[model samples]
Target: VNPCCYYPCQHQGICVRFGLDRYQCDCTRTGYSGPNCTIPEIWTWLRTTLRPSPSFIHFLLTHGRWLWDFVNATFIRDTLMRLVLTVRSNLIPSPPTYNIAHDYISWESFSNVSYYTRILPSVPRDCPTPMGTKGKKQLPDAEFLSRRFLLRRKFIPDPQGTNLMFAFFAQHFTHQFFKTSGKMGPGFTKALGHGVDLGHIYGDNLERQYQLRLFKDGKLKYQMLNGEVYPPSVEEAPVLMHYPRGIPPQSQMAVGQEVFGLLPGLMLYATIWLREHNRVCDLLKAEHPTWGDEQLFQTARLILIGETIKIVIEEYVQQLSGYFLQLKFDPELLFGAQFQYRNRIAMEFNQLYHWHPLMPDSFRVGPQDYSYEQFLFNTSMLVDYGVEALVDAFSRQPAGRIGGGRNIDHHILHVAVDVIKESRVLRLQPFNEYRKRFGMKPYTSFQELTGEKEMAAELEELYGDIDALEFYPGLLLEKCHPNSIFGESMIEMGAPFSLKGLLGNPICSPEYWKASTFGGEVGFNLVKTATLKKLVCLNTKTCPYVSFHVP
Candidate 1:
């Protein structure tokens, strides 16, 4: 037996194996040259060195609400926001390793990734084993672990007051850009447009989008049901990888049927956007009375996209950050800043956004209780009740806490296991490997990653060593902090990817972020001043209160 199984190498150094009692550390390209890679080289210490996310100094000053309030009250708020943006945009550890095209800054490269970008170098194909374990004995059986630890036994309320609407919005938002292809192993995403393109509302690709278009007055085709504007119904199987999963034609709405259209959350958001698009066209048509239908549609689309990004940053992400910084989506804030490039979703980012615990075991929509099975892959309840009902119901309940001993619903355990399996198939590096890549120190023990007694024991028993901890489960099992929506690992990793995708959008660039591009000052203000509540109230008559957070 070898004591070298300890893996004493530091700072991403690899430990190569040979003799039973012998192993050597390879410390190349790590910006360190010492016996064990502990000494930082010139470049690593002074500059080009990444500050741990929310740097130690930054973290120390931010825990107090009064301090945060004082910072927000003065000019420091704007300065801090821009400074944070500058750092996040410039400090990406991985370049565009894979994109839609060979050129990293091409039109197709923005918010698209086919081959996954590596935060650390790719792992060898021989990791974690084909049986989805790290070849360790006395470890918990995968099935028993699933039943005992991973299943949601009872609902646990999110401590930060995040409601089901935020959780639902998260599902609806991430799925738009991160739809991975089932056919192409685990590394490739489907050819979905990879930004906040509102793909869920307008369709991800061209064919379905055009098919749904009315081509008159810059409006998507809609069916007026009960005098309420609704997305057109699906009449046939779409030109997709497959049919929209078993619900027959005309039963479901059409706008964003490709991803989660069958659910009320997706269906509801899609309808709001459809109305918002048509509303934008109305404003544009008035200003440009002589503009053709094509121009009106195109111009309205630009505004709609701006609106989506604004709401995402100002509302959705602000809640997620657990910070009171009043996060803004100013288009020109980072317009000409350095390190600007197209954002292709990484494979790791795609995996990190799987917040399945947000879904409760059952949904209460308009006096009816639909279990997980009925709540998903079918929006029949959405048709029966209205958007107002769904909105009220979602905001009224707490979503299951993401970590903190709460787990995904038992009914969907197999689906969650497949998510873990994909990481093994792709040969992803361990949890601590990714943490270090993101400018954070590696977690030394399972207790360090998760402070809870049982969760720590579960992980320690399975991994035996902290370095062998898997990425997906590690993300979920990490400790959730107070007043925060997710764990530290989730926040640090997920925040940067989202910032790049949103800020590097083509519309947010200085060249395109102007009143002229949005058709005029009126159209620009129309979108620039948009809010989620304004959007819902503008379109609907029945909604009492619309919020992603519980009021």
Candidate 2:
């Protein structure tokens, strides 16, 4: 009665008998389909060709059912008109639009632009605990529900042409340009452009580095001492310490180097940027024999900053945003007569930059699973394994899907909450307030808010009113727009805010583009042709095969 007795199946299919009179054929390989596995599966071939990842195929296989169910349950309005009207109402939302015209009127206006236009209006409230907790028996946990239904374990695969490293590079460069501090000790007020203006690449604190001096070709250049390069020995403070063992401790590191050390990828890039500066200094010394320490240092610093900015606007932002048509690194944007563009960093600008999904749960170096913690404040990876291997490893891994559902990991959730808690200036504004600000209607019920019945019910049970939900958690639950990288409000708030931050600075303007300020043509040309690909090629000796964009 064995089915193999006849060997009826074709195309390498396994044939098995289901019963005395029946049989079945299993075709595991793609490209062949039929009752007897003889016919060509043209559709499957096309599908595999178009969407290559197994995760993506699995998503497609499962998504059709839910998508259809959602469509049937939900009602659609005139979306085109709604989109048009939304933009017209508030023109500019969140933290309010800055007046570039009145900027230079007085120090008063400059002060107003800096302090007033930040996230000062938000109100704080405790977020609901995860489900199955003893504290809230009656109320559902929105944070818990978000992790389950809204934040999926599923990850949308990036298109085949792009790599993940590009996203991290753009983010690191952006952080260096803008950082607003939280509350400080008595009488200590925060300034907007501490890192942006000065070539303070190691960040605001100068004591973080060693005061070591090095003699290279009879010119004195600063070198980081062993203490600056090595991690601290203590684990309790753990601000800048490396774990000799492979295990990650319960508490996260304090990002002792700067804001960039919070993530391993950014930390690695920052180190490279620092090294590149020294490399540039050496090149300058070879050409200019009698140049002093100040001249060589300033020239090298200007070149690095220019290169960083160029890569950010031209390559990183352009690809991540998929807004190549709208944004550019145009020198024209930098040109205007008497443009004393006051650099004012907006609070909402930082709030919108929650790109935690870019880092996966685990870090992989070659075949080994490197812990996220080990890489933080730990230069062991760079020192032990070498940069070439690390760069190659980065290219093989892809970042989580940008505007897709279920991409938010648990670590990202915790980090987001921690950031909110740390920023005393930040408040948990009502979700509906943001909607109204962005010109969208407030939903009447949970069902209207989310098409799914279970999700809406959870939201309703947690926050009694539709308008009372917190901004970050609410944004996490929202479905992304068609062919967009973020929810509507994020896109609306981010586009104008980022453009203003980049173009509104006098440093970026032609007026400040002088030899004294930026080392003349040397600085201009450094940024003009800078690309992420070029930076990667220049900094790292070897990189894996990957497309330049984050597809």
Candidate that scores best on TM-score: 1
How many clashing pairs per prediction, in order? 1, 2
Off by over 4 Å in 2: 1-120, 123-152, 158-163, 177-200, 205-256, 259-263, 283-290, 324-326, 334-340, 373-377, 402-405, 419-425, 435-453, 514-517, 543-551
Put down candidate 2 lDDT per residue, 352-433, tens digits, no spaces: 5766656666667777887655655554455455445555667667766544446666655665555444332244345565
- Candidate 1 global lDDT: 0.71
Clash pairs of candidate 2? 152-406, 159-551
Model 2, position 467: C-alpha lDDT score: 59
Error of 1 at 290 (Å): 1.5
* Error at 433, model 2, angstroms: 2.9
Give all candidates' CA lDDT scores: 0.71, 0.49
Residue 262 displacement in candidate 1 (angstroms):
2.5
